[PDB]
Design a protein around this ligand. Structure first.
Ligand SMILES: *[C@@H]1O[C@H](CO)[C@@H](O)[C@H](O)[C@H]1NC(C)=O
Ligand SMILES: *[C@@H]1O[C@H](CO)[C@@H](O)[C@H](O)[C@H]1NC(C)=O
Ligand SMILES: *[C@H]1O[C@H](CO)[C@@H](O)[C@H](O)[C@H]1NC(C)=O
Ligand SMILES: [Cl-]
Length: 231
């Protein structure tokens, strides 16, 4: 996250730290056994950490988990960038609520353009040139008119939200992918892609629009037929 500050230690109890072969991502604990992240974060040998804040001062209740079930969309396009960038993972063992662990459930509605959203992650705090923080950084951004992202990014995937600061300065960045966009207290986005360098004017973040995936998520977890992702 560029342009933010250290998250409050208690404000991200649902935030998962996802490490995979040569890669850092975030994710979101949506219940006691399941995490949503970006499918592009699945780079192999995934380890998912819950209840983490400082990477160097381990919370007493921090936990390591592994994928036991893994789902993503099979109706993606190839002509848009990272279409349906979402992956639903069941953890190998559940995680109970604790000081630093609690799920964030599914949104009741998508967020209005203009909504203030929180972004967070352990991704780079500088762009260009990686500077990885020990603690997750957080910033407030806004849901932007989708046309802003359409203007910035030819080949933008559908089922996404455009979010950032129109003037730039605050943004997610490399390493924050998979992490949540929280607007009006609701889990609304999973960071997928955005401009590099990050935090550029009119080059916002593209977040998979969680609301659109509610039924898919529920179908998968509640017994899964061969559930289909939203078109
Ligand atoms: C889809 O496009 C990506 C680049 O956007 C490319 O890496 C990939 O090979 C394409 N899929 C096919 C047809 O192999
Ligand atoms: C880091 O990358 C960017 C260009 O991609 C630039 O600021 C710089 O030349 C590189 N290294 C540093 C820190 O000088
Ligand atoms: C890390 O992930 C890459 C790509 O998925 C894979 O080639 C490699 O085997 C993984 N690391 C190991 C040694 O398991
Ligand atoms: Cl599907």
């Amino acid at each position: 996250v560029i342009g933010g500050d250290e998250c409050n230690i208690n404000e991200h109890r649902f935030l998962a730290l996802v490490y995979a072969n040569g890669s850092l991502c975030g994710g979101t604990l949506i219940n006691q056994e399941w995490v949503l992240t970006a499918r592009h974060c699945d780079r192999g040998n995934m380890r998912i950490y819950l209840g983490m804040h400082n990477l160097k001062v381990l919370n007493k209740d921090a936990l390591r988990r592994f994928p036991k079930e893994k789902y993503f969309c099979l109706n993606t396009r190839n002509d848009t960038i990272w279409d349906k960038d979402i992956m639903l993972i069941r953890l190998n063992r559940p995680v109970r609520n604790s000081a630093h662990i609690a799920p964030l459930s599914l949104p009741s509605n998508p967020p209005s353009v203009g909504s203030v959203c929180r972004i967070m992650g352990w991704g780079t705090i500088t762009s260009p040139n990686a500077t990885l923080p020990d603690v997750p950084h957080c910033a407030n951004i806004n849901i932007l008119d989708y046309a802003v992202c359409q203007a910035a990014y030819k080949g933008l995937a559908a089922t996404t939200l455009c979010a950032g600061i129109l003037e730039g300065g605050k943004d997610t960045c490399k390493g924050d992918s998979g992490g949540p966009l929280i607007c009006n207290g609701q889990f609304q986005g999973i960071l997928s892609v955005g401009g590099n360098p990050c935090a550029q004017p009119r080059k916002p973040g593209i977040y998979t629009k969680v609301f659109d995936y509610t039924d898919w998520i529920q179908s998968i977890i509640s017994g899964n037929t061969d559930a289909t992702c939203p078109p």
